Scaffold this active site. Structure first.
Site, mmCIF file in Angstrom:
data_model
loop_
_atom_site.group_PDB
_atom_site.id
_atom_site.type_symbol
_atom_site.label_atom_id
_atom_site.label_comp_id
_atom_site.label_asym_id
_atom_site.label_seq_id
_atom_site.Cartn_x
_atom_site.Cartn_y
_atom_site.Cartn_z
ATOM 1 N N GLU A 1 54.963 69.440 -106.459
ATOM 2 C CA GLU A 1 55.517 67.937 -106.651
ATOM 3 C C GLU A 1 56.795 67.761 -106.140
ATOM 4 O O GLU A 1 57.612 67.302 -106.728
ATOM 5 C CB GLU A 1 55.524 67.925 -108.271
ATOM 6 N N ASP A 2 57.012 68.067 -104.875
ATOM 7 C CA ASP A 2 58.285 68.023 -104.287
ATOM 8 C C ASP A 2 59.361 68.883 -104.559
ATOM 9 O O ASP A 2 60.611 68.706 -104.215
ATOM 10 C CB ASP A 2 58.838 66.677 -104.121
ATOM 11 N N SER A 3 59.286 69.998 -105.371
ATOM 12 C CA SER A 3 60.253 70.991 -105.754
ATOM 13 C C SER A 3 59.691 72.293 -104.645
ATOM 14 O O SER A 3 58.693 72.612 -104.345
ATOM 15 C CB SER A 3 59.752 71.656 -107.120
#
Ligand SMILES: [Zn+2]
Ligand SMILES: [Zn+2]
Ligand SMILES: [Zn+2]
Ligand SMILES: [Zn+2]
Lengths: 57, 51, 1070, 51, 113, 46, 56, 55, 62
Positions: free
Chosen positions: C701-703
């Site tokens: 999730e975009d981490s």
């Protein structure tokens, strides 16, 4: 309502002046002013009252 | 510019400034016989994937 | 001339204009010229003014002469980089201090060379263009519907009016009135249709006929003379008929000027010579001219009400007040108060005075805040003009200067007219989006030329003046306009045209002027105006007696004492504003106009280069022609938030907050444009060894996962500076403050932290390691000492004492800190591919490739499919080659480089033709069943690190009025539980918890009266005494628990005379 | 003392990375186990630098 | 804007400066990790807490009343991979079939034939 | 031995105290930094 | 997605209904822990190569 | 502004998901836990633990 | 802003190699990296991308 609000009181005779917690002052340490907004238009009013009377006596 | 350094033991866990390694090659079964991989490809895996 | 050639031309451009042309160019125009015309107009007083003197920077301080000032100082000492103003006054004189524009003309920087600057501590790379008021660097922001033009609008079915035509008018130079002309058309498309128009100061409206007779045309048909230009157009004429009848009652100029209510008749004139269509001229003997306009107008009206011309396109971009202009309208407002000020000294002398502070202090106020219009009880101004120049990164500052505003669903759009002049991508998300535009690289703004040297140059080359016109002898007479005025027509124009155009190309009518010929309507547009955005183009002209061609040749190129000024003085390039653009044909690729490249589909000009329609922002984005446009628009913003180097002098700068990336790195892939954005020498990031794959599931999730090991070898580490600053205030009444190391001494007024790291001078030393709250400075008032922000800490980096204009003790302190990337800090590439750290693994734990090579970053394959940003994928490949080849990898926009090509280059070096590589899982060593897109990609370390946000509170500083917590994490505040949060809990039926507005905030014990339900009660809490005289009670009293905000609600209502009675028992029942 | 354009801890970093000898590194002790308050010859190597 | 924009969680003190939340409980708040921040409130009464755990516990929230269907599923990696792992072509040998059973906490302690 | 304030250009060790003006032994330029500390600063190599 | 998403038939929707808030809430972590782990070893990625179309 | 909604034992920072946390957990930075408290009355069941937590 | 001792990515030293490189250019007119012994791109990018600011910083006075 004859008890809680009679038509006449929509006109003010004696003005209720609210206390400090209402119009707190904010001093800049000690030797500097700092007064609230209302603590002024109370004084502006107060002054506009004084002069009036001193024209009716 | 005047300094004074103090060096100490330590390892790569504690800090990268320790581990004496710095890059290490590792490969096995170049000819995928064990099939520990599924080659990506458009037409021919063998020709498109460097030997 | 091939494509790769046009680059040298562009190089040629910036060698001469530089990224901030606009700003400076427009400033000099105010100093040099403008400034004069302003002081010399409605000056002379019942005492006149002559030439004005504008000296260089000075510092008039008491206790010293007048020190010749320099940028880098005013900066540190918080002063004002302005110089003096003198005027040869008639019966030499000082009148105000004008804030100069850095890098301009009166700014010493304008000359000093490379070495010259390094000595003034001023970073060479600083392109300037900003002002330096009271310290901080202020940047004037461009303020964007043009004036003096005819518009026709249809007005909704529900309205007594059918159509209407308007024209906003204002004197291009002189006061500048904002009163518009309304030429209405009553009677909807049915009812038995008059034409009336609105004039300035007139209560009601007047029927056009009268406006004519009142003008100087008294007979009918002589009126229809002006409106309609073709006796055989009965329709139009018909329309007019009913109108004539309206005015049939007033038969002459006497009555004409009357009905407009001896006393009244005289005023009638006025509103016609100074208010009516005031542009054109407000002289006198030109009545005729305005009449032909009001005729050309009443015409335009009907031309539509008869379906021959559409309603005017409100958003046709062709139809920007930079810095220079702003000072203008501003100065006047000022000098004019000085003007009528000097009038009072002269009106008291029944027998020096000029307070040259209104022009000094006036100027400062504006430029300081952002409120143009004066001060006084006049906030009715605009805030925004003049801001605080960005200094996060170099590309940040550039961008900021090249910015435009627009006072408030159609305007925000990217219009066609926007091509070339404004960057399509760079523009803020949310809120104001599209109301803030940035300039392309090639764009420039007009400045303001003179009309006459062209009015003359005309009425002597075929321009038979308007004064004496005859519509029928001269039928298809091409009418010509000058800056919005009608200076007569012309017979055969074809030549008038290709003569002016030959005049500009030799350079005898400023390359900045606009000339548009609209054959399809028979008109000639002339524009000198100041604020017209224009771009440059190659001229084509079929001038080849050897074929069919760009005037420029490969001989001019290799020839590049040959600037850009010559490329223009030879008619090889032209400055095309948006208006003139309308009537030209531009060829894209100069040249041209494989199963890999993108499929490609009278000329007057060619495009210097398409990749020039971009502005500072996108110019750094690799293959912006390969990503989903909305993404480019994002990176267009994050760039102004990455880390790097904003100047080199930074080590001698005392600015609050500034970040430097420990070790920069010019990208493995670049834009040819970067070359003018000095980007290679001032990078915004580093080339990280990316690896797009799934792993621990911490890159979800975009981490992203960042390789600790290399984070240690210093990857993405950055210094952080800060500067707390203070003064020693005084009073005309000799009572001064102090800088010491105070303790005890009758007052107590002190802090919590320690003062011990304070030498006796009330300062720290630059070696000191300060932290927690440790007093950074020591001041007193016969405490006023400064504490290091509670969340911070580091080491002192530089202290400095200094004078103030008022001989006061000025002292600024700077603290340094090295900031290490942490499991939360935000990063991103140049593709809106933003993400934060989720965890950090080391080399072992990390996945790897036989070579050894291991990733520095692991972003998730999931951030690719819907983001669509593919160029991202490409920059990697390309950069994986440029890595191996040592050659710089070009990613620049529309070029001739393909994915099929690069892939072949990567196969020559050894690795898979698509990037993918084999990898062995760092935990077990067993190969990965899959392959990975492993390849070096540029990554900017956006500011926004966790430890600057992490905040937690439990009963902290309470507000005063309310008694609720206080706002903001900086002042130890508390997060709000606003409405929406309320709602939810209520949805949960979480009754108690929600009630628990009281425990976590206000709450308070008030004492009510059992009778007059008020907060009167005099509760002396000890001797129990309760009371409430006036109601005289001491027996029936209650205590209650309400939110102090509410206690206050009531005290408030009372002082407004309303009485909120609080009763503890229901009596009304139900 | 340090008049270099680089900051203190920037150089500090640098030296952390400079590779030192570590042959008989095994016959030295971790400052954590050595009974000396802070450091000493029996567990550390001190260095000078003047420029 | 949801009953689920606020949910009661079991506290787990951990290192590093950040609120670490589970993936499947992502879509309810509708967050991502590109910088997004989260507010946390702490009950204070013995009942306040209870009220938070008996009605706002994340587990109670799994089936959303607005669309009478759950409102938290398996996202990204876990989803994407669960697919692969299922195909008839996906086979695992003892060594791993063991380290896999170990990761399931409730594992009965019995390796299936 | 000993130093108090320095000048932004002609880095010449000065030294003053209240009212003794805030300039330099020449250059009018009234800046001046407050030279390093005596107490050594200790750093970590990470 | 169809068998384990925030969908109607959802194995989740069913486990919640059949076993309870608790049991199902645990179900996530497990299905997770097994899979995430597995993926950690089987690997997965994406690259320009996934976006190119056949020669013809 | 002050009654239908006020600022209120609360904290806020940056989120990043963790694949090893029961669905209903929520990892809180030590720092924060050491800041937010909880009024637990002394009772002969938790006196022992509390007197420890206090020391 | 000076040369980075050891490559982030793999770790191999690279402080010394700066002058060698910036030299094999000016004079020997040259690949440079390859002979300097900088094989895999991780360290490669290290040198080939450094923009030595320190030089300009050094151009400042006190
Ligand atoms: Zn009462
Ligand atoms: Zn020792
Ligand atoms: Zn000096
Ligand atoms: Zn390397």
């Amino acid at each position: 309502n004859e008890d809680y609000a009679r038509p006449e009181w929509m006109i003010i005779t004696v003005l209720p002046v609210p206390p400090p917690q209402v119009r707190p002052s904010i001093a800049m340490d000690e030797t500097t002013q700092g007064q609230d907004d209302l603590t002024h238009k109370l004084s502006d009013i107060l002054k506009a009252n004084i002069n009036v009377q001193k024209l009716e006596m | 510019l005047n300094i004074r350094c103090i060096a100490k033991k330590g390892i790569a866990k504690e800090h990268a400034k320790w581990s004496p390694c710095s890059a290490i090659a590792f490969e096995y079964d170049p000819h995928n016989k064990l099939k520990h991989t599924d080659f990506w490809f458009e037409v021919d895996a063998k020709k498109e994937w460097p030997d | 001339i091939t494509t790769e050639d046009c680059w040298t031309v562009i190089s040629a451009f910036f060698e001469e204009k530089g990224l901030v042309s606009q700003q400076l160019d427009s400033f000099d125009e105010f100093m040099e010229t403008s400034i004069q015309d302003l002081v010399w107009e409605e000056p002379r007083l019942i005492i006149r003014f002559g030439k004005i003197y504008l000296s260089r920077p000075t510092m008039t301080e008491a206790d010293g002469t007048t020190h010749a000032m320099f940028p880098q100082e005013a900066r540190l000492r918080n002063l004002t980089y302005s110089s003096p103003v003198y005027l040869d006054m008639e019966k030499k004189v000082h009148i105000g201090k004008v804030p100069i524009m850095l890098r301009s003309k009166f700014c010493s920087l304008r000359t000093l060379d490379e070495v010259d600057l390094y000595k003034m501590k001023e970073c060479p790379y600083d392109m300037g263009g900003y002002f330096v008021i009271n310290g901080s660097e202020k940047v004037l922001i461009a303020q964007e519907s043009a004036a003096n033009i005819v518009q026709v609008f249809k007005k909704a079915a529900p309205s007594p009016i059918s159509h209407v035509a308007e024209i906003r008018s204002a004197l291009e130079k002189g006061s500048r009135l904002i009163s518009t002309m309304q030429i209405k058309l009553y009677g909807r498309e049915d009812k038995g249709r008059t034409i009336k128009a609105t004039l300035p100061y007139v209560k009601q409206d007047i029927p056009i006929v009268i406006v004519f007779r009142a003008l100087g045309v008294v007979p009918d048909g002589e009126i229809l003379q002006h409106i309609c230009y073709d006796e055989n157009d009965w329709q139009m004429l018909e329309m007019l008929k009913p109108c004539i009848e309206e005015g049939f009652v007033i038969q002459d100029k006497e009555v004409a000027l009357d009905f407009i209510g001896e006393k009244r008749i005289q005023y009638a004139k006025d509103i016609l010579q100074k208010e009516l269509l005031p542009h054109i001229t407000q002289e006198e003997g030109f009545e005729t001219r305005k009449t032909f306009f009001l005729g050309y107008m009443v015409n335009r009206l009907l031309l539509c009400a008869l379906e021959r011309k559409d309603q005017d396109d409100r958003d046709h971009f062709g139809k920007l007040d930079l810095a220079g202009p702003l000072l203008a309208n501003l100065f006047r407002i000022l000098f004019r108060k000085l003007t009528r000020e000097i009038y009072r000294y002269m009106q008291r002398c029944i027998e020096l005075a000029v307070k040259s502070t209104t022009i000094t202090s006036g100027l400062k106020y504006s430029l300081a805040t952002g409120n143009w219009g004066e001060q006084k009880k006049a906030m009715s101004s605009r805030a925004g003009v003049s801001q605080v120049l960005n200094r996060y990164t170099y590309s940040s500052t550039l961008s900021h200067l090249r910015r435009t505003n627009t006072p408030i669903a159609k305007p925000r759009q990217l219009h066609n007219t926007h091509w070339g002049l404004v960057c399509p991508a760079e523009t803020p998300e949310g809120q104001a989006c599209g109301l803030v535009k940035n300039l392309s690289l090639l764009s420039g703004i007009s400045i303001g030329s003179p009309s006459e040297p062209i009015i003359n140059f005309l009425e002597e080359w075929g321009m038979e003046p308007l004064e004496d016109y005859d519509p029928a002898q001269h039928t298809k007479s091409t009418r010509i306009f000058v800056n919005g005025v009608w200076t007569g027509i012309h017979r055969d124009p074809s030549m008038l045209v290709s003569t002016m155009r030959d005049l500009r190309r030799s350079g005898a009518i400023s390359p900045e002027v606009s000339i548009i010929r609209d054959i399809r309507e028979r008109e000639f547009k002339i524009f000198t105006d100041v604020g017209r955005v224009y771009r440059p183009l190659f001229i084509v002209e079929d001038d080849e007696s050897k074929d069919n061609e760009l005037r420029i040749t490969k001989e001019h190129i290799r020839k590049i004492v040959y600037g850009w000024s010559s490329l223009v003085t030879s008619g090889v390039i032209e400055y095309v504003d948006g208006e003139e653009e309308e009537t030209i044909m531009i060829a894209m690729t100069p040249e041209d106009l494989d199963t890999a490249k993108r499929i490609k589909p009278t000329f007057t000009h060619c495009e210097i280069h398409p990749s020039m329609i971009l502005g500072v922002a996108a110019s750094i984005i690799p293959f912006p022609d390969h990503n989903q446009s909305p993404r480019n628009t994002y990176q267009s913003a994050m760039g102004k938030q990455a880390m790097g180097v904003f100047l080199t002098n930074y080590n001698v700068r005392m600015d609050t907050m500034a970040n430097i990336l420990y070790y920069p790195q010019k990208p493995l892939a670049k834009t040819q444009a970067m070359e003018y954005l000095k980007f290679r020498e001032l990078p915004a990031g580093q080339n990280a060894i990316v690896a797009i794959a799934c792993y621990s599931g911490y890159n979800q999730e975009d981490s992203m996962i960042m390789n600790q090991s290399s984070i240690d070898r210093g990857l993405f580490r950055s210094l952080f500076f800060r500067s707390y600053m203070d003064q020693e205030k005084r009073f005309g009444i000799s009572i001064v403050e102090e800088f010491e190391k105070p303790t005890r001494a009758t007052t107590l007024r002190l802090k919590h932290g320690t003062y011990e790291k304070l030498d006796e001078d009330g300062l720290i030393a630059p070696g000191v390691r300060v932290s927690g709250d440790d007093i950074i400075i020591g001041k007193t008032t016969p405490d006023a000492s400064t504490p290091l922000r509670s969340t911070e800490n580091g080491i002192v980096d530089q202290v400095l004492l200094t004078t103030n204009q008022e001989g006061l003790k000025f002292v600024k302190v700077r603290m340094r800190t090295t900031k290490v990337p942490q499991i939360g800090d935000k990063f991103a590439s140049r593709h809106g591919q933003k993400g934060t750290i989720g965890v950090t693994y080391r080399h072992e734990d990390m996945p790897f490739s036989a070579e050894g090579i291991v990733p520095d970053l692991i972003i998730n394959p999931h951030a690719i499919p819907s983001r669509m940003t593919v160029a991202h994928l490409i920059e990697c490949l390309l950069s994986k080659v440029g890595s191996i080849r040592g050659y710089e990898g070009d990613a620049t926009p529309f070029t001739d480089l393909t994915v099929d090509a690069v892939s072949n280059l990567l196969r020559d070096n050894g690795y898979q033709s698509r990037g993918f590589e084999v990898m062995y899982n760092g935990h077990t060593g067993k190969k990965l069943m899959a392959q990975v897109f492993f390849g070096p990609t540029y990554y900017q370390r956006l500011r926004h690190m966790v430890d600057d946000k992490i905040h937690a509170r439990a009963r902290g500083p309470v507000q005063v009025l309310t008694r609720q917590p206080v706002e903001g994490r900086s002042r130890d505040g508390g997060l709000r539980f606003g409405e929406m949060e309320r709602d939810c809990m209520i949805a949960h039926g979480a009754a108690g918890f929600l009630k628990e507005l009281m425990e976590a905030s206000d709450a308070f014990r008030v004492h009510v009266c059992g009778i007059c339900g008020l907060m009167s009660v005099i509760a002396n809490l000890k001797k129990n005494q309760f009371e409430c005289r006036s109601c005289k009670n001491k027996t029936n009293i209650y205590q209650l628990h309400i939110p102090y905000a509410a206690k206050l609600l009531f005290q408030e209502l009372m002082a407004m005379n309303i009485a909120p009675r609080l009763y503890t028992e229901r009596s009304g029942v139900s | 003392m340090n008049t270099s354009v680089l900051a203190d801890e920037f150089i500090s970093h640098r030296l952390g990375l400079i590779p030192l000898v570590s042959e008989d590194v095994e016959e030295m002790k971790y400052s954590r186990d050595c009974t000396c308050e802070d450091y000493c010859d029996e567990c550390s190597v001190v260095l000078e630098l003047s420029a | 804007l949801h009953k689920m924009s606020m949910m009661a969680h079991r506290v787990k003190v951990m290192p590093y400066s950040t609120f670490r939340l589970n993936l499947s409980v992502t879509s309810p708040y509708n967050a991502d990790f590109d910088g997004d921040e989260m507010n946390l409130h702490v009950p204070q009464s013995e009942e306040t807490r209870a009220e938070l755990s008996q009605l706002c516990a994340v587990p109670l929230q799994i089936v959303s009343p607005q669309s009478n269907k759950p409102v938290m599923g398996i996202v990204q990696d876990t989803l994407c991979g669960v697919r692969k792992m299922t195909l008839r072509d996906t086979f695992i040998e003892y060594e791993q079939v063991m380290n896999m059973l170990f990761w399931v906490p409730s594992w009965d302690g019995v390796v299936p034939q | 031995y000993g130093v108090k304030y320095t000048c932004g250009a002609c880095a010449h060790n000065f030294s003053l105290n209240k009212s003794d003006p805030v300039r330099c032994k020449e250059c009018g330029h009234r800046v001046i930094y407050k030279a390093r500390t005596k107490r050594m600063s200790k750093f970590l190599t990470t | 997605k169809k068998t384990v998403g925030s969908g109607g038939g959802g194995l989740i929707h069913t486990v919640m209904r059949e076993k309870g808030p608790k049991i199902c809430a645990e179900l996530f972590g497990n299905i997770q822990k097994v899979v995430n782990y597995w993926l950690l070893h089987n690997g997965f990625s994406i690259g320009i190569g996934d976006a190119i179309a056949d020669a013809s | 502004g002050n009654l239908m909604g006020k600022r209120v034992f609360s904290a806020r920072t940056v989120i990043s998901g963790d694949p090893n946390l029961e669905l209903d957990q929520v990892g809180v930075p030590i720092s924060i836990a050491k800041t937010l408290s909880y009024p637990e009355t002394v009772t002969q069941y938790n006196i022992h633990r509390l007197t420890e937590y206090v020391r | 802003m000076i040369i980075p001792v050891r490559c982030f990515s793999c770790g191999k030293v690279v402080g010394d190699k700066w002058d060698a490189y910036l030299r094999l250019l000016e004079e020997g007119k040259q690949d440079a990296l390859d002979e300097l012994k900088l094989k895999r791109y991780c360290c490669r990018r290290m040198v080939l991308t450094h923009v030595d600011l320190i030089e300009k910083f050094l151009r400042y006075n006190p």
